Ligand binder design. Structure first.
Ligand SMILES: CNc1nc2c(ncn2C)c(=O)[nH]1
Length: 154
């Protein structure tokens, strides 16, 4: 039993946009932009909507890059995260009460201040690879076990 989420990386040839989450799940970490998919909404439409809500950016073309399932031991619901990439956006990043977006050069990605799984799958994202992953966490800082494989079809 899993709940759908989206995650969007605005990845340009020389930088990536991340947002410092100020509240809720993952507050205090840099992350891509995303959230829960709504009833009657497609996953891609949810990804576009969340990118706007959290970053202020409008995306047209979204590319599927991965699917990652997160398990937190002691929590019944799995997070089924559909990851997307875009290099084509409109607008300028907006800081709000919920999120502080900032651009990072690719060699300065702040892995120590990101979810630990990102250290595994971001290198694949940066090399334009697609993937399926599963990360089992104990709390929010420890990966107990994981699987990650490259795929041709997300
Ligand atoms: C659990 N791992 C994970 N969670 C995320 C991420 N970004 C937002 N949230 C809530 C991420 O990259 N990994």
């Amino acid at each position: 039993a899993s709940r759908l989420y989206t995650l969007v990386l605005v990845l340009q040839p020389q930088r990536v946009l991340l947002g410092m989450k100020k509240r809720g799940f993952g507050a205090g970490r840099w992350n891509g932009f995303g959230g829960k998919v709504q009833e009657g909404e497609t996953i891609e439409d949810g990804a576009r909507r969340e990118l706007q809500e959290e970053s202020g950016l409008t995306v047209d073309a979204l590319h599927k890059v991965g699917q990652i399932v997160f398990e937190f031991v002691g929590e019944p619901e799995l997070m089924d995260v559909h990851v997307f990439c875009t290099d084509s956006i409109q607008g300028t990043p907006v800081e709000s009460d919920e999120m502080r977006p900032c651009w990072f050069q690719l060699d300065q990605i702040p892995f120590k201040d990101m979810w630990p799984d990102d250290s595994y799958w971001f290198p694949l994202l940066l090399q334009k690879k697609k993937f399926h992953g599963y990360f089992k966490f104990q709390g929010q800082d420890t990966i107990l076990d994981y699987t990650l494989r490259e795929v041709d079809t997300v």
